[PDB]
């Protein structure tokens, strides 16, 4: 492992972030390709020919999660979930999901949970001393955003395939 004060640590961190980003995105796209994992991670499901919830609820959430730049912004995402479940007309749209609003809240509130779903071994992808902890904190919001977007994309691709 590279000493923390080492002058090439900025360049090493560049290669690490690239390797982690590609690993996260590939593993996300694997997960999102399967109906069972999409339901496992976000609760969203396809019931024959209509999606649970409707794609406008997924678009609504996806337009909120794009504001998750850091763990400090996470109250915006859990804030939005509060206003969803605060009112029955919104709550009832997600209530036909596999517990999706709790699953979304867990994915955003728990810093570990994204990494458990991705289940990537980052030891081959890190070389900086304490690199994993620094990269996990740095890439957490991006990894969450990556996975949620992949799942929603995979869901809507199958949703269209069911309708085509």
């Amino acid at each position: 492992p590279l000493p923390t004060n080492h002058p090439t640590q900025d360049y090493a961190r560049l290669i690490e972030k690239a390797a982690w980003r590609e690993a996260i995105q590939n593993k996300a796209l694997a997960l999102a390709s399967s109906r069972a994992k999409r339901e496992e991670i976000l609760g969203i499901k396809i019931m024959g020919k209509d999606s649970q919830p409707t794609m406008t609820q997924l678009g609504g959430f996806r337009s909120v999660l794009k504001r998750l730049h850091s763990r400090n912004n996470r109250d915006i995402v859990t804030g939005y979930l509060t206003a969803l479940e605060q009112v029955s007309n919104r709550k009832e749209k997600w209530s036909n999901t596999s517990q999706g609003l709790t699953k979304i809240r867990n994915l955003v509130t728990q810093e570990n949970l994204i990494w458990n779903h991705l289940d990537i071994d980052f030891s081959p992808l890190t070389i900086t001393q304490n690199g994993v902890n620094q990269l996990k904190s740095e890439l957490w919001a991006e990894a969450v955003r990556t996975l949620v977007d992949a799942i929603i994309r995979g869901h809507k691709r199958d949703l269209e395939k069911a309708q085509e």
Partner: protein, 405 residues
């Protein structure tokens, strides 16, 4: 996010959704050019290129015809290093170069563009015009699409949306003149038609692929908001609760709910049961209608040089394409081409105040196109020129052949 529209049913064609990530408007990057001169000057074509960059004439990236790619150059500096000479080599090593005033050379030669016709359409929403935002809001279901424009957000009609409505009207006019039916054909077949495959382009399928000679800008609202002001609207949970502050802020009327709602108006829609007369609850939905959003003029660019290459330089073939383009602009000015969401549902009709036709390096026979029109029926165009176009148009109609040979 976007979708193809089936030409027979008028609805989102199955399998023709698309998504594209875009660097936002107002983003900056360096002009990063070095030129090695082998003679004691600066080349004309390179001076012309820099003038074109300052004019905004050069497009970069994907979706050039369908909303994107426009760039403009500012802060242009030219530094000279006489590498033929000791003073210039040591200047290159040490002194950051001899400054050229660009304004001198830029004045000392005429800028020459390749042929194009600019169309600038001054328009206003006759009824609220919006593209739908893909996500529902909390208080409002159907929200206007916004985009980042510099440090602000503005409401946007993507040039993809204006392109597709114009393409649809072009194709409808041709299929009427031919009495050709697109009900049987699939979406890709429904698009392949003569004169529209050149003005709007054909998909590159192995090749009939063509880029459109006609390019449409993203049209942004004259209104703008801070990003957190719009998030306050998106996050608003109650239509008569925290939405009213958020809309008052975003429209710029924090103390006047009347003036705020003359710009952005929340609208409820309810479906009524036919047997009982009851609100078919669950079929209640809400739209934030941009009733008083002012918009910048629609910028359409016809690449006349692109058409010439398709028609093999002979400008007589241009006249049927120009004729179609004018017939489409006549429909756009006569409110026959609604734009965006909800066009049969109370939105999307536009007024056209003015069409400015701004040709650069046009051929003499199309030179009457250099005009500002305010009659919707194009009677500001010379009648001898419109009859001239009308004759070439009628000849093509008689044999609706593929110009492009």
């Amino acid at each position: 996010e976007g979708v193809g529209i089936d030409r027979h049913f008028g609805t989102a064609a199955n399998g023709f959704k698309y998504s594209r990530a875009v660097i936002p408007k107002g983003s900056k990057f360096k002009l990063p050019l070095t030129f090695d001169s082998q003679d004691d000057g600066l080349p004309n074509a390179l001076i012309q290129l820099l003038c074109a960059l300052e004019a905004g004439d050069i497009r970069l990236g994907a979706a050039k015809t369908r909303g994107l790619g426009r760039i403009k150059l500012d802060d242009l500096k030219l530094k000279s290093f006489a590498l033929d000479k000791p003073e210039g080599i040591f200047s290159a090593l040490l002194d950051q170069g001899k400054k050229l005033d660009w304004n001198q050379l830029k004045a000392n030669v005429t800028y020459q563009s390749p042929p194009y016709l600019g169309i600038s359409i001054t328009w206003n929403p006759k009824d609220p015009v919006m593209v739908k935002a893909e996500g529902d809001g909390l208080a409002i279901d159907i929200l206007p699409l916004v985009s980042q424009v510099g440090s602000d957000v503005r409401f946007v009609i993507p040039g993809s949306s204006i392109k597709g409505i114009l393409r649809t009207q072009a194709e409808r006019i041709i299929r009427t003149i031919c009495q050709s039916n697109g009900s049987e054909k699939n979406f890709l077949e429904q698009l392949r038609i003569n004169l529209v495959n050149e003005l709007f382009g054909s998909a590159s399928l192995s090749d009939l692929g063509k880029i459109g000679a006609l390019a449409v800008n993203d049209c942004f609202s004259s209104l703008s908001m801070t990003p957190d002001q719009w998030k306050a609207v998106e996050n608003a949970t109650e239509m008569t609760g925290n939405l009213q502050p958020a809309l008052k802020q975003a429209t710029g009327y924090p103390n006047n709910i009347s003036q705020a709602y003359k710009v952005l108006q929340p609208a409820m829609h309810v479906a009524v049961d036919r047997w009982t007369g009851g609100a078919a609850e669950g079929m209640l939905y809400s739209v934030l209608e941009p009733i008083g959003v002012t918009w910048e003029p629609i910028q359409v660019h016809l690449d006349i040089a692109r058409l010439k290459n398709y028609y093999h330089g002979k400008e007589e073939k241009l006249k049927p394409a120009i004729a179609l383009l004018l017939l489409v602009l006549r429909d756009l000015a006569n409110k026959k081409i609604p734009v965006g969401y909800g066009t049969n549902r109370g939105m999307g009709t536009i007024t056209v105040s003015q069409i400015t036709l701004n040709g650069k390096a046009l051929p003499t026979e199309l030179e009457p196109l250099n005009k500002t029109m305010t009659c919707p029926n194009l009677t500001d165009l010379d009648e001898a020129f419109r009859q001239d176009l009308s004759t070439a148009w009628k000849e093509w109609i008689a044999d609706p052949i593929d110009l492009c040979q």
